[PDB]
Structures are given as C-alpha cells and as structure tokens.
Design an enzyme around this catalytic site. Structure first.
Site, mmCIF file in Angstrom:
data_model
loop_
_atom_site.group_PDB
_atom_site.id
_atom_site.type_symbol
_atom_site.label_atom_id
_atom_site.label_comp_id
_atom_site.label_asym_id
_atom_site.label_seq_id
_atom_site.Cartn_x
_atom_site.Cartn_y
_atom_site.Cartn_z
ATOM 1 N N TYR A 1 -15.230 -1.605 5.681
ATOM 2 C CA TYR A 1 -14.782 -2.259 4.458
ATOM 3 C C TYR A 1 -14.966 -3.771 4.496
ATOM 4 O O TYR A 1 -15.002 -4.383 5.565
ATOM 5 C CB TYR A 1 -13.309 -1.930 4.184
ATOM 6 C CG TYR A 1 -12.337 -2.625 5.111
ATOM 7 C CD1 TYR A 1 -12.014 -2.081 6.346
ATOM 8 C CD2 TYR A 1 -11.735 -3.824 4.748
ATOM 9 C CE1 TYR A 1 -11.126 -2.713 7.196
ATOM 10 C CE2 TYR A 1 -10.848 -4.465 5.592
ATOM 11 C CZ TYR A 1 -10.547 -3.905 6.814
ATOM 12 O OH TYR A 1 -9.662 -4.537 7.657
ATOM 13 N N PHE B 1 -11.428 -12.065 2.390
ATOM 14 C CA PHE B 1 -10.208 -12.328 3.145
ATOM 15 C C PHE B 1 -10.165 -11.504 4.430
ATOM 16 O O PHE B 1 -9.476 -11.866 5.381
ATOM 17 C CB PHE B 1 -8.962 -12.055 2.289
ATOM 18 C CG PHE B 1 -8.910 -10.675 1.691
ATOM 19 C CD1 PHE B 1 -8.457 -9.595 2.432
ATOM 20 C CD2 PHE B 1 -9.282 -10.464 0.373
ATOM 21 C CE1 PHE B 1 -8.399 -8.328 1.879
ATOM 22 C CE2 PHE B 1 -9.221 -9.200 -0.188
ATOM 23 C CZ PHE B 1 -8.781 -8.132 0.567
ATOM 24 N N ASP B 2 -10.911 -10.404 4.455
ATOM 25 C CA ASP B 2 -10.959 -9.539 5.629
ATOM 26 C C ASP B 2 -12.135 -8.569 5.562
ATOM 27 O O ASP B 2 -12.593 -8.209 4.479
ATOM 28 C CB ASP B 2 -9.650 -8.759 5.773
ATOM 29 C CG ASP B 2 -9.544 -8.037 7.103
ATOM 30 O OD1 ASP B 2 -10.108 -8.535 8.101
ATOM 31 O OD2 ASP B 2 -8.893 -6.972 7.153
ATOM 32 N N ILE C 1 -2.748 1.121 1.357
ATOM 33 C CA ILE C 1 -2.330 0.824 -0.011
ATOM 34 C C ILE C 1 -2.701 1.965 -0.954
ATOM 35 O O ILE C 1 -3.616 2.738 -0.672
ATOM 36 C CB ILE C 1 -2.951 -0.490 -0.526
ATOM 37 C CG1 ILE C 1 -4.477 -0.430 -0.441
ATOM 38 C CG2 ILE C 1 -2.411 -1.678 0.254
ATOM 39 C CD1 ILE C 1 -5.163 -1.672 -0.963
ATOM 40 N N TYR D 1 -0.681 -5.011 -3.077
ATOM 41 C CA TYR D 1 0.480 -5.522 -2.356
ATOM 42 C C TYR D 1 1.536 -6.102 -3.296
ATOM 43 O O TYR D 1 2.519 -6.693 -2.848
ATOM 44 C CB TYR D 1 0.047 -6.574 -1.334
ATOM 45 C CG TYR D 1 -0.846 -6.019 -0.246
ATOM 46 C CD1 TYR D 1 -0.305 -5.450 0.900
ATOM 47 C CD2 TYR D 1 -2.229 -6.059 -0.368
ATOM 48 C CE1 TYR D 1 -1.116 -4.939 1.894
ATOM 49 C CE2 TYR D 1 -3.047 -5.551 0.622
ATOM 50 C CZ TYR D 1 -2.486 -4.991 1.751
ATOM 51 O OH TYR D 1 -3.300 -4.483 2.739
ATOM 52 N N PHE E 1 -12.584 -4.074 -2.953
ATOM 53 C CA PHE E 1 -13.023 -3.578 -1.651
ATOM 54 C C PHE E 1 -14.405 -2.934 -1.693
ATOM 55 O O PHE E 1 -14.627 -1.969 -2.422
ATOM 56 C CB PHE E 1 -12.020 -2.563 -1.098
ATOM 57 C CG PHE E 1 -10.764 -3.178 -0.558
ATOM 58 C CD1 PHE E 1 -10.712 -3.645 0.746
ATOM 59 C CD2 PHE E 1 -9.631 -3.279 -1.346
ATOM 60 C CE1 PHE E 1 -9.556 -4.210 1.250
ATOM 61 C CE2 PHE E 1 -8.470 -3.841 -0.849
ATOM 62 C CZ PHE E 1 -8.433 -4.308 0.452
HETATM 63 C C1 FK5 Z 1 -0.103 -3.503 14.327
HETATM 64 C C2 FK5 Z 1 -0.929 -3.756 13.137
HETATM 65 C C3 FK5 Z 1 -0.548 -3.147 11.807
HETATM 66 C C4 FK5 Z 1 -1.706 -2.309 11.280
HETATM 67 C C5 FK5 Z 1 -2.958 -3.132 11.306
HETATM 68 C C6 FK5 Z 1 -4.257 -2.516 11.611
HETATM 69 C C7 FK5 Z 1 -4.333 -1.068 11.998
HETATM 70 C C8 FK5 Z 1 -5.519 -3.343 11.540
HETATM 71 C C9 FK5 Z 1 -6.172 -3.197 10.169
HETATM 72 C C10 FK5 Z 1 -7.664 -3.505 10.237
HETATM 73 C C11 FK5 Z 1 -5.455 -4.085 9.156
HETATM 74 C C12 FK5 Z 1 -6.031 -5.497 9.093
HETATM 75 O O1 FK5 Z 1 -5.647 -6.234 10.234
HETATM 76 C C13 FK5 Z 1 -6.681 -7.091 10.669
HETATM 77 C C14 FK5 Z 1 -5.574 -6.220 7.831
HETATM 78 O O2 FK5 Z 1 -6.300 -5.705 6.743
HETATM 79 C C15 FK5 Z 1 -6.110 -6.401 5.529
HETATM 80 O O3 FK5 Z 1 -6.637 -7.745 5.668
HETATM 81 C C16 FK5 Z 1 -6.883 -5.648 4.450
HETATM 82 O O4 FK5 Z 1 -8.205 -6.029 4.143
HETATM 83 C C17 FK5 Z 1 -6.292 -4.589 3.759
HETATM 84 O O5 FK5 Z 1 -5.593 -4.839 2.562
HETATM 85 N N1 FK5 Z 1 -6.395 -3.331 4.195
HETATM 86 C C18 FK5 Z 1 -7.169 -3.016 5.407
HETATM 87 C C19 FK5 Z 1 -8.138 -1.874 5.122
HETATM 88 C C20 FK5 Z 1 -7.417 -0.694 4.482
HETATM 89 C C21 FK5 Z 1 -6.727 -1.111 3.189
HETATM 90 C C22 FK5 Z 1 -5.742 -2.254 3.424
HETATM 91 C C23 FK5 Z 1 -4.512 -1.719 4.110
HETATM 92 O O6 FK5 Z 1 -3.743 -0.724 3.476
HETATM 93 O O7 FK5 Z 1 -4.151 -2.141 5.234
HETATM 94 C C24 FK5 Z 1 -2.997 -1.485 5.719
HETATM 95 C C25 FK5 Z 1 -1.764 -2.226 5.288
HETATM 96 C C26 FK5 Z 1 -1.659 -3.706 5.503
HETATM 97 C C27 FK5 Z 1 -0.655 -1.497 4.652
HETATM 98 C C28 FK5 Z 1 0.631 -2.186 4.304
HETATM 99 C C29 FK5 Z 1 1.724 -1.693 5.247
HETATM 100 C C30 FK5 Z 1 3.078 -2.281 4.871
HETATM 101 C C31 FK5 Z 1 3.446 -1.879 3.449
HETATM 102 O O8 FK5 Z 1 4.689 -2.447 3.105
HETATM 103 C C32 FK5 Z 1 2.381 -2.359 2.472
HETATM 104 O O9 FK5 Z 1 2.698 -1.904 1.175
HETATM 105 C C33 FK5 Z 1 2.237 -2.789 0.180
HETATM 106 C C34 FK5 Z 1 0.996 -1.850 2.862
HETATM 107 C C35 FK5 Z 1 -3.052 -1.429 7.242
HETATM 108 C C36 FK5 Z 1 -4.392 -0.883 7.720
HETATM 109 C C37 FK5 Z 1 -1.904 -0.605 7.815
HETATM 110 O O10 FK5 Z 1 -1.976 0.715 7.325
HETATM 111 C C38 FK5 Z 1 -1.946 -0.587 9.339
HETATM 112 C C39 FK5 Z 1 -1.417 -1.899 9.868
HETATM 113 O O11 FK5 Z 1 -0.658 -2.741 9.032
HETATM 114 C C40 FK5 Z 1 -4.635 -6.485 5.132
HETATM 115 C C41 FK5 Z 1 -4.442 -7.498 4.010
HETATM 116 C C42 FK5 Z 1 -3.734 -6.842 6.307
HETATM 117 C C43 FK5 Z 1 -4.099 -6.007 7.523
HETATM 118 O O12 FK5 Z 1 -3.284 -6.374 8.612
HETATM 119 C C44 FK5 Z 1 -2.025 -5.740 8.535
#
Ligand code: FK5
Ligand code: CA
Ligand code: CA
Ligand code: CA
Ligand code: FE
Ligand code: ZN
Lengths: 358, 122, 117
Positions: C32, C42-43, C62, C88, C105
C-alpha cells in the site's frame, strides 16, 4: 546498552559533541567537517548552541551575496536533495570532495526526507569552510510555508527546538535566488517568468523575505516546463500551472526568447523529479544546445520512485552527467512518531477486545 | 458493582494474550484470583489506565521499559510488517528521546511525558 | 457534487484474476501507499520494502479497508478513497493523520491466505 535484541544493528550516537570535538583542529574558527559527517551519519545530534552557530554563521555569509550569483567553470551543479542525507554523502563521493571541487546546489534541501536538518547543518558547514567555491540557491521548499506544511518544522522541533527552525527560516531568506554560471547558463530552481525579461529583473528583487504567492520571485522557485515542451501546438509562452496550483508552465519558444535576449546558452534547473536523475530538453535553433536542463539529485525519491540521481559537471569546454543510486538509511516512523504513540492505539483495542472475552 | 463482578469472576489468537494474563498475575505465580481479577479490571472503570499500558511493555515488572522489552512486545503486534532492523532502529531512537535521565531504560514518568497527547473502556 | 456511499469507493487501476476475493476473516498481503487529498504520501509499505499483512473484515484495520479490500481480486491494483468516518475520524491519528481527513490508498492485493498472484 548491551542488552538489545538485534545487536547487529548499530545504535545511534548517544551524546552531543564537546567544544573540542566540534571545532576543527586545523581551523578552530570552523566546525570539524569529518566529525560532522560521521556524527550525522550515526544519527547524532549537536547541542542547540552548536547548531545555532552553524546556521547563523551560514546566514552571515549568505547575506553578503547578491540575488544573482556569478561563477565560472569548473562547477558541479546539483538538484534537489530533500533531506536525503545518506544520498547526499553519495553525491559528494560521485561529484568530488568539496575541499577540491566547486559546487552549485539548486535548492530543496528540506522536507519529505527525514534527515533535512542534517543536510542543512552539513551544507551550511561546507558553506562556512568554502564560501567562495560552494554556492547554495533557494528552492521553493526553503520557506516558512512549505516547511510548516510538510516535515521540516516538525523535524527541527523534534530533533532540536523551535529556535533552530526560526534560524533556518531566517537563513532561507538570505539564500540567493539565481546564478549565472560561466556567463553561459542561468541556474535556478523552478523556471521562467512572464515578469522575467532580463537578468536585471532578478537583481532588483528583495529576496530577504518569504516567497510571494505570485510574481517573479515565486516563478523562479515554482515554474515548470510544459509537459509537451518543445512540441507546443501554440506559440504561447506561459500558462497557469494546474499541477502546482501556482506560478506557470513555460514553453520552448519562451525559453528561446529569453536565451536570445540575454545571450545565454541554456537554463539549468531542478524542481522536477527525473527517472535518470536528469532530463535534456529540446535544443535551441541558435546554438543547437539543450534549451533547458533539469537536474535531480535525490535517488529513490521518497523511497518509492526508485529513480537515479544525477549531477552536472562542467569543466573547461567539457560537460557530462554523473548518475548514482540510492543508499540505505535508518528508518523513521511517519512524522517522527515514537513507538509509544505508534502502538498505544492498537494496544488499547486489543486489551478492550480481550476484556470482552471475559 | 463488585458483587456483579464477583459473580462474573465465579462464572469464569490475541497477540497480547501472554502479556495481559501476566499483568493480572500481580505476584507472578502463574494463576489469577479474585483480588487480582478485580484489581486488573478496576483500572478500566486516566492515571490508572496509563499505568496499565506501562505494564504491557514492562515484562519483568521492574518498573522500567528496557530496549529489549520494547522490541519484543512490539514484535508481537507488528510481526513481519516491519523488518528487525527497521523496528530496532525506531526502538533505539524512542528510548533516547524518552530517557531523560540517561539510564538506558524508560520509567513510568518518562513514559507518560511521551504520550501526554494520547482509550480503554468497559 | 454530493455522492451517496458507505464511506469507501474503489478505482480499479489494474485487474487481478477476477476469481479470488478476500472474505471476512481471511489474511491478506498488500503493498500500500497512503496519500492525503493533497497527494502527499504519509506512509507506504514500499518504504519498508515489506508487504503489509493483516486479517481483513475483523476490525483490525480501518473500516475503509475492511469494506474496500474484499471488492478486489487477487493481483488487482486499485485505489481506495476513504471518508474520515471509515478512516480515523475527527481525532485522526496524530502526528500522521489530521482530523477529518479523506484517505487515498493505492493498494495491490498480493496474496489471500498464502495464495499469491
Ligand atoms: C505495534 C504497532 C501497531 C500496529 C502497527 C503495524 C502492524 C504497522 C503497520 C504498517 C501500521 C503503520 O505503522 C508504520 C502505520 O500505518 C499508517 O500510516 C497507515 O498508512 C494506515 O492508515 N494503515 C496502514 C495500512 C492498513 C490501513 C491503515 C490501518 O488500519 O492501520 C492500522 C491502524 C492504525 C488501525 C487503528 C487501530 C486503533 C483504532 O482506534 C483505529 O480506529 C480508527 C484504527 C494498523 C495496521 C493496525 O491494525 C496495526 C497497528 O496499529 C497508519 C496511519 C498508522 C500505522 O501505525 C499504527
Ligand atoms: Ca496469582
Ligand atoms: Ca523491565
Ligand atoms: Ca530512564
Ligand atoms: Fe523538489
Ligand atoms: Zn522544488
């Protein structure tokens, strides 16, 4: 810290340099370049005082320079860097050591890359050591607006302080806008302007300020060549840049009109990413020489473009392109996010879910 | 209140399974009784919530988050999504920025001062 | 100018096999690249040179992904436009994602339960 899981991975430099380490043993009035090169490479930081000194000393030199620099060959023209410090190290290894090589940077030293302040502090340190053989032009990213919008302001506030950021902003205003290299080439970051008729127009600019949303100073930093440059169906010179949202696209007859007016061979620029690190545009009818040259010095731009970088070397009557690939760099979480802020939202979810199971 | 929870306690593939079960076990015996059951849940009824989040990373329960502990706990959630090098590097840099007294570890005070900007309910 | 959808729309850039679709509970492997509406990245999983893996349709990621990815076939390159509510929300994800942000994305479905393309 001996107790780490992945010991084969080198840890960042823990401490800040002392005065004896910072200042050069050969010239105690200037920073140690070899030390700075290694310290930044290992993600080390300077003290606030040391970092401020480099920027202010850099500002001191830049303020004495004209808007339009005038330099002769030999020279090594470099394009965008964008906080890619570990590729900047490769750049100097390909182009040659600044201690015996004349350089000209076209701007965009910050943002996007997560090592922008390292690029600035080191390039400024080089400017201090070599004020008459290394020159730095202003890019569109060297301003308060873009640095605050993107990552540079965040990087300064994170790695150092707000005082450091404000120092760079003040220093960016002192950066020259353009250069005439060897009385043959107009060197800028962006491109041409409908208000740019002669070189005299550049000289009458008050550069000690933030770039305007429109006008000559804006276009010099923002203007691009047309996508169909050299193949325009119309005879128009400029048109609104729908991509940038500001400034203009300039055309081939526009470039030729300027070059013939000012007796210049070509326009060496940057601002646009190239796959080969460079792009040669349509040659003029007057000299048969490429009217526009785009130089891009950021390889694997944004870690995804997978593009080569390049620098332009012009010596005697010889000119050639030198390319180079990217170099591995330490990893940062987006916007310098710490692993606690990074994981806690996910931890809270998994704990909450585990609670329901009870 | 407690009487209802005591009734639920009498009636009784998450990556944080081994961690959370170890947090409830406050004496480190291997089991969990009602007093440990209620105390563990009582934190979710802002300080106490942050204290629980700290215990997630603190494996040996010494009051400090070490570099190794941080890497291991993060790896439980991240898996292969980050390389070992990439994770170890951001772990190293997080420690340095949080270790204000320079002991190589992260106290609870240093932990809260890092996430003062940032979640768990019942 | 006002469109009516749940919170995510998919733009097929390159077709997959058109047969294998991620179902609820399946594990997917995706490369992605996330950008904001301004086009700024941003990522990206490409940054880490490591394909992203997660369980789809179980609330791991998400809402935009849990509803967008199952619409893709194995090997498909597509773009997901995600509303803040499927993203988010107003809180966003500081310091990475601003509040009330529409997410874009670029997603390439590389694998579904260890069946690759
Ligand atoms: C120990 C580490 C934690 C663990 C981190 C990883 C496995 C590393 C993984 C590459 C994440 C990236 O880390 C470099 C980074 O990817 C982002 O930059 C991004 O592009 C993004 O939006 N993605 C990533 C690709 C899938 C969609 C989305 C996501 O759903 O991501 C999910 C997300 C943040 C969901 C939140 C969870 C909390 C709720 O409250 C909220 O509800 C609103 C939604 C991620 C995958 C979680 O399932 C798993 C984690 O959090 C986020 C901007 C912030 C995120 O870091 C956290
Ligand atoms: Ca017990
Ligand atoms: Ca510990
Ligand atoms: Ca400490
Ligand atoms: Fe640029
Ligand atoms: Zn630029």
């Amino acid at each position: 810290t001996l107790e780490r899981v992945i010991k084969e991975v080198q840890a960042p430099a823990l401490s800040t340099p002392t005065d004896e380490m910072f200042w050069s043993p050969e010239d105690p009035s200037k920073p140690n370049l070899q030390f700075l090169k290694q310290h930044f490479y290992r993600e080390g930081r300077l003290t606030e005082e040391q970092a401020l000194w480099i920027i202010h000393a850099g500002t001191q030199i830049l303020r004495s320079e004209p808007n339009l620099l005038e330099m002769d060959a030999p020279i090594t023209v470099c394009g965008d860097v964008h906080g890619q410090y570990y590729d900047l190290m490769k750049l100097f290894e390909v182009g040659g050591d600044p201690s015996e090589t004349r350089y000209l940077f076209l701007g965009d030293y910050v943002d996007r890359g997560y090592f922008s302040i390292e690029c600035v502090l080191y390039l400024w340190a080089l400017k201090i050591w070599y004020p008459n053989s290394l020159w730095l032009l202003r890019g569109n990213h060297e301003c308060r607006h873009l640095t605050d919008y993107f990552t540079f302001k965040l990087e300064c506030k994170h790695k150092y302080s707000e005082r450091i950021y404000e120092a760079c902003i003040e220093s960016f205003c002192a950066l020259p806008l353009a250069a005439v290299m060897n009385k043959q080439f107009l060197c800028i970051h962006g491109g041409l302007s409908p208000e740019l008729h002669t070189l005299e127009d550049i000289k009458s600019i008050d550069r000690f300020r933030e770039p305007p949303t429109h006008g000559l100073m804006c276009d010099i930093l923002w203007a691009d060549p047309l996508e169909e440059f050299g193949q325009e169906k119309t005879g128009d010179y400029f048109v609104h840049n729908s991509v940038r949202g500001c400034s203009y696209f300039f055309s081939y007859p526009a470039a030729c009109a300027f070059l013939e007016k000012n007796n210049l061979l070509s326009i060496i620029r940057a601002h646009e990413a190239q796959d080969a690190g460079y792009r040669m545009y349509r040659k003029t009818r007057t000299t048969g020489f490429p009217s526009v040259m785009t130089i891009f010095s950021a390889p694997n731009y944004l870690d995804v473009y997978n593009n080569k970088a390049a620098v332009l070397k012009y010596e005697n009557n010889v000119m050639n392109i030198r390319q180079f690939n990217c170099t591995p760099h330490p990893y940062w979480l987006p916007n310098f996010m710490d692993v606690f802020t990074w994981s806690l939202p996910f931890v809270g979810e998994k704990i909450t879910d585990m609670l329901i199971a009870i | 209140e407690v009487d209802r929870l005591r009734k639920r306690f009498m009636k009784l593939s998450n990556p944080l399974a081994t961690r959370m079960i170890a947090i409830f076990d406050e004496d480190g015996g291997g089991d969990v009784d009602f007093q440990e059951f209620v105390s563990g849940l009582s934190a979710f009824s802002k300080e106490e919530k942050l204290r629980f989040a700290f215990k997630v990373y603190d494996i040996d329960r010494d009051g400090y988050i070490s570099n190794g502990e941080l890497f291991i706990v993060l790896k439980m959630m991240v898996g292969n999504n980050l390389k070992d090098v990439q994770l170890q590097q951001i772990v190293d840099k997080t420690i340095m920025e949080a270790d204000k007294d320079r002991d190589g570890k992260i106290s609870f005070e240093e932990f809260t001062e890092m996430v003062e900007n940032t979640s768990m309910t019942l | 100018k006002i469109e009516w959808h749940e919170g995510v729309t998919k733009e097929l850039k390159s077709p997959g096999n058109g047969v294998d679709f991620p179902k609820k509970g399946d594990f997917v492997t995706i490369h992605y690249t996330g950008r904001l509406t301004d086009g700024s990245k941003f990522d990206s999983s490409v940054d880490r040179n490591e394909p992203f893996q997660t369980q789809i349709g179980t609330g791991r990621v998400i809402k935009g992904w849990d509803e967008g990815v199952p619409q893709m076939s194995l090997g498909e390159k597509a773009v997901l436009t995600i509303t803040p509510d499927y993203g988010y929300g107003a809180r966003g994800f500081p310091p990475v994602i601003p509040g009330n942000s529409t997410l874009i994305f670029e997603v390439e479905l590389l694998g579904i339960n260890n069946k690759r393309a």
